[PDB]
């Protein structure tokens, strides 16, 4: 997973797009600095990162790793994030909304299959490439420990509200999924009526969620249901991806394909 | 202070200044080793050189075995630079976390010299305003010197260019820091020796760790893994104290911590 900056022919921060040599367009992300010593262990990082290989998954392509020039290489994706595609002008039907949704339990089923929480799932690290399938991405490096060199609390469970030292768990994403089931449907980011993001921080710890009724979209009752279940206080009470999967998959086939 | 020039210096390596900017190793053709920070480089500014010469002067006032001194300034035409000692072991930080580990009565020793060096700068009514690991650098006999790297105390050279942070500077741009402010930093620098890291690692973003810490969180005390004396946890939370009023001075926690040392670590 080693890349040199001469492999390339051509070009939440500074990105570029870049043109390898045979392996196609991809996206790089370049930190420049004086030297590490280190290096041995952001490239185990990034061999770990790579070993995530999913359809629904963002794949790290390679890293830089040269005097002063450290870089990550991910794959291209089409059409931005997924806040960007639901704000686009040409709406998106239920039907690949419905899908989209599926492929977001794929992609969290398979990360937590292999033992890794996101811990900062939300609209901005679901990107998306030209038919609207999706991959999650990690664009905050809130998994590369390392390599991390260098409005953002609306998903985040509130057990982690001024709450820094608790350890995230499953039940963290599944939050996350649950404010971002609701603003798929709205095609907004929730929230728009706070005060003051200190006081909405402790509403949402004592139990204020995303106004449902501000969905005006027809939102089919059992993703209603789905949601308000994924954002329970107690995170034990919230379903698990593979549990959320076995009954979302049969719906979606039945109802919204 | 010695007036430098660029052609005292035979050749120089680039080097990880951890966090502030680029720096290198340059030798000195009749001195030696020494470290670089390269300020300006650009058209002449004469006006300035008397000023930037007298600013560095100033500073070269402070003069204590646990602060750094600046060996010499190049003022030239275009070109501005400061040159101090090269600290062979690098930043306190990279000390922690080395292969070694560091015996608890080094440890103790380096708390000392930190309390020393800090007292010394409130004495002479210098706010440090950016006291953390990577500010404090450490010598081959593993006794340390607190630098200013960030230049937050450099007017003239840095007008010429949150781990640490006391709660009521977060998310306050019109922050004035205070001594307070410093012995706030202390406490987790204190944490981050015994921890061997840098604190809130689990934190996912940087307005949920500025909300939580700003609400009272602190450096997770129980993620001490190898044995911190119950006197420095007490003395860090004490030093981290939300109202500012509460914390101690520097030659206040001298006081308590100097017979702790002499009694226990040493
Ligand atoms: C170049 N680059 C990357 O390699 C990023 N890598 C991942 O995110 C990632 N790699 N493996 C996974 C899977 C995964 C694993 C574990 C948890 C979750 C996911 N994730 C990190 O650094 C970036 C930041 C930002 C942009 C960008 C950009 C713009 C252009 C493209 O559209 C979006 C905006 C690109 C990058
Ligand atoms: C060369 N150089 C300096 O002269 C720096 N000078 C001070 O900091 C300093 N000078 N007088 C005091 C006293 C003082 C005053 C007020 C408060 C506290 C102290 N302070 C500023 O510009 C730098 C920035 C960064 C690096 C570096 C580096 C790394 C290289 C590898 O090893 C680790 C360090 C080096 C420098």
Redesign the pocket.
């Known amino acids: 997973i080693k890349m040199k900056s001469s492999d390339f022919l051509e070009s939440?921060?500074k990105?570029s797009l870049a043109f390898h040599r045979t392996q196609g367009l991809?996206?790089?992300?370049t930190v420049y600095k004086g030297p590490n010593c280190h290096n041995e262990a952001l490239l185990e990082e990034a061999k770990m990162?790579?070993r995530?290989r999913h359809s629904r998954?963002?794949?790290?392509?390679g890293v830089i790793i040269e005097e002063g020039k450290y870089?990550?290489?991910?794959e291209?994706?089409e059409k931005?994030?997924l806040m960007h595609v639901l704000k686009a002008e040409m709406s998106t039907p239920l039907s690949v909304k419905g899908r989209i949704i599926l492929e977001i339990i794929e992609?969290m089923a398979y990360?937590h299959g292999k033992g890794?929480?996101?811990?900062d799932?939300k609209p901005?690290?679901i990107?998306v490439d030209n038919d609207f399938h999706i991959?999650?991405?990690?664009?905050?490096?809130?998994?590369?420990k390392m390599?991390s060199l260098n409005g953002t609390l609306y998903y985040m469970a509130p057990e982690h509200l001024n709450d820094v030292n608790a350890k995230p768990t499953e039940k963290s994403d599944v939050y996350s999924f649950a404010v971002v089931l609701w603003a798929i449907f709205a095609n907004k980011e929730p929230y728009e009526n706070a005060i003051a993001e200190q006081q909405l921080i402790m509403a949402i710890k004592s139990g204020n969620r995303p106004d449902v009724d501000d969905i005006t979209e027809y939102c089919p009752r059992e993703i209603i249901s789905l949601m308000k279940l994924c954002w329970e206080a107690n995170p034990e009470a919230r379903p698990t991806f593979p549990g959320i999967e076995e009954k979302f998959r049969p719906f979606y086939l039945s109802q919204l394909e």
């Open positions: 939440f921060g990105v991809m996206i790089m992300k990162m790579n995530l998954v963002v794949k790290l392509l870089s990550l290489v991910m291209y994706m931005g994030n992609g990360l890794v929480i996101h811990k799932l901005e690290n990107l991959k999650i991405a990690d664009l905050g490096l809130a998994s590369f390599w």
